[PDB]
Write a protein that binds this ligand. Structure first.
Ligand SMILES: *[C@@H]1O[C@H](CO[C@@H]2O[C@@H](C)[C@@H](O)[C@@H](O)[C@@H]2O)[C@@H](O[C@@H]2O[C@H](CO)[C@@H](O[C@@H]3O[C@H](CO[C@H]4O[C@H](CO)[C@@H](O)[C@H](O)[C@@H]4O[C@@H]4O[C@H](CO)[C@@H](O)[C@H](O)[C@H]4NC(C)=O)[C@@H](O)[C@H](O[C@H]4O[C@H](CO)[C@@H](O)[C@H](O)[C@@H]4O[C@@H]4O[C@H](CO)[C@@H](O)[C@H](O)[C@H]4NC(C)=O)[C@@H]3O)[C@H](O)[C@H]2NC(C)=O)[C@H](O)[C@H]1NC(C)=O
Ligand SMILES: *[C@@H]1O[C@H](CO[C@@H]2O[C@@H](C)[C@@H](O)[C@@H](O)[C@@H]2O)[C@@H](O[C@@H]2O[C@H](CO)[C@@H](O[C@@H]3O[C@H](CO[C@H]4O[C@H](CO)[C@@H](O)[C@H](O)[C@@H]4O[C@@H]4O[C@H](CO)[C@@H](O)[C@H](O)[C@H]4NC(C)=O)[C@@H](O)[C@H](O[C@H]4O[C@H](CO)[C@@H](O)[C@H](O)[C@@H]4O)[C@@H]3O)[C@H](O)[C@H]2NC(C)=O)[C@H](O)[C@H]1NC(C)=O
Ligand code: CL
Ligand code: K
Lengths: 207, 207
């Protein structure tokens, strides 16, 4: 029979008020003999009817996949409200309820430290600009780089690593042409996190 | 029926000649009614006879657990030889075979860069010393810190992260009390990887 997977909003969407966070209920292995699926959405046990449900899309494995999308209020997600998708279908003798919420825990403010390339790396044509982000909790975070206000996306960020004090840390590595660094261009690490003031901080880095 | 699990040597064991790398073949869910277990080992399909098999040990669930350990040669493992454990037991319709070997792929040599704390961190009781290891392949690697002849305790290392060129990088973060950093103590990141000369390199930093 069908199975259901419930997905949280992207952290950046929940932290920046202009963006649009969504909880997504995904139903897979919907059969052709019983293809009708009903969604019921609940926020802290209270039914809500503003979800937008997409039409069944057939998969290459001859099963249907039907998706319902619930737009959420930033502050509801951040305050730990619970989001329940209930999925009814004639092949389910009982519906499937999945419930999700923001990761729990006392929030801790990330400290953001930018680190220039090592001297040893200056023999290479590209150098590594490092953004250390430590002391944060919970682990939901967004880390981006830019220069002159424009995205610098040739970077890679480690997963959050649990540190010895219960907090998380990560590193972000931006790779740039050495000529850009030694000519004094300014790069900046931007970090978004619920424990930050206005959910946003930016640290710069230059020669 | 019995099930078999085959574990590889630790990367560091294969890289330092002082150590003794081993492949371990564990058999669980061995019954009282059919308790005899026979191991046969093969390297590249050629039977070898120098494994050390321990006598069975009954578990709290009233099944036996049986372990056989094959010492491997460092160069055999690094040269990609295949280690097959075959397990026979009369409760099996056929012997179970497990095979393992080293991660495949063109080796690429890590570059190792130490980075001091951000000046912004010098207001904290503790500071973060960072070890960047980039450009290595495969991902099997060991990273340690030491100072004054003794390993450091309070470090954490990220998982390998796939970089944009197909190689991996990681960061290791050593946290030291600020007094120790300000007193000029030298801290050292040691990296062990098959693509390094002598499978080892070290970088050090001080105030
Ligand atoms: C009866 O009891 C025995 C003994 O258990 C002990 O006693 C009982 C009474 C309880 O009190 C227990 O709490 C107590 O531990 C039970 O035996 C267990 O059986 C299960 C399977 O049913 C085995 O599970 C496997 O575990 C391995 C990892 O095992 C390591 O890590 C464990 C801690 O996480 C540790 O306990 C183990 O000892 C072992 O530790 C390692 O040991 C080696 C050798 O000494 C050492 O070098 C390592 O350093 C050490 N590591 C440590 C300590 O961290 C895990 O790999 C298995 O997962 C694979 O298989 C699953 C299918 O079972 C599958 O779902 C997974 O996805 C995964 O699949 C694998 O995936 C990889 C890559 O994805 C792929 O390459 C593989 O091919 C693939 N394999 C597949 C698909 O088969 C698995 O979870 C326990 O290890 C074993 N316990 C012991 C101590 O041996 C027994 O089950 C009980 N019977 C009943 C009926 O209850
Ligand atoms: C029929 O086909 C269905 C569709 O599969 C797709 O199409 C077919 C034709 C093949 O080509 C597939 O390879 C292809 O993917 C199958 O549906 C899949 O079912 C399995 C369960 O059987 C689902 O596995 C579950 O995956 C969860 C995570 O899923 C996210 O990440 C996937 C990438 O790894 C991605 O493919 C998914 O789309 C989903 O991605 C997220 O989507 C949301 C919605 O928009 C986004 O907002 C997110 O950003 C996306 N995140 C990304 C991309 O990272 C797991 O969490 C889950 O694990 C949990 O439960 C299991 C129990 O099953 C535990 O064991 C586990 O430990 C954990 O607790 C589980 O693994 C899979 O997601 C389904 N795929 C899709 C696309 O819906 C059918 O299974 C298949 N039927 C058959 C073969 O009979
Ligand atoms: Cl905004
Ligand atoms: K969105």
């Amino acid at each position: 029979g069908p199975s259901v997977f419930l997905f949280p909003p992207k952290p950046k969407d929940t932290l920046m008020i202009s963006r649009t966070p969504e909880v997504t209920c995904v139903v897979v292995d919907v059969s052709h003999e019983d293809p009708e699926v009903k969604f019921n959405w609940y926020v802290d046990g209270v039914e809500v009817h503003n979800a937008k449900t997409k039409p069944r899309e057939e998969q290459y494995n001859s099963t249907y996949r039907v998706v319902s999308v619930l737009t959420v209020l930033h502050q509801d997600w951040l305050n730990g409200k619970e989001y329940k998708c209930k999925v009814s279908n004639k092949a389910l003798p009982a519906p499937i309820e999945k419930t999700i919420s923001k990761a729990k825990g006392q929030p801790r403010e990330p400290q953001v430290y930018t680190l220039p390339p090592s001297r040893d790396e200056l023999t290479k044509n590209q150098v590594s600009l490092t953004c250390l982000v430590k002391g944060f909790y919970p682990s939901d975070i967004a880390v981006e780089w830019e220069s002159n206000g424009q995205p610098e996306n040739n970077y890679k960020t480690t997963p959050p690593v649990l540190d010895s004090d219960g907090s998380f840390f990560l590193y972000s590595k931006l790779t740039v042409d050495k000529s850009r660094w030694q000519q004094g261009n300014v790069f900046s690490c931007s970090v978004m996190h619920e424990a930050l003031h206005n959910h946003y901080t930016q640290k710069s880095l230059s020669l």
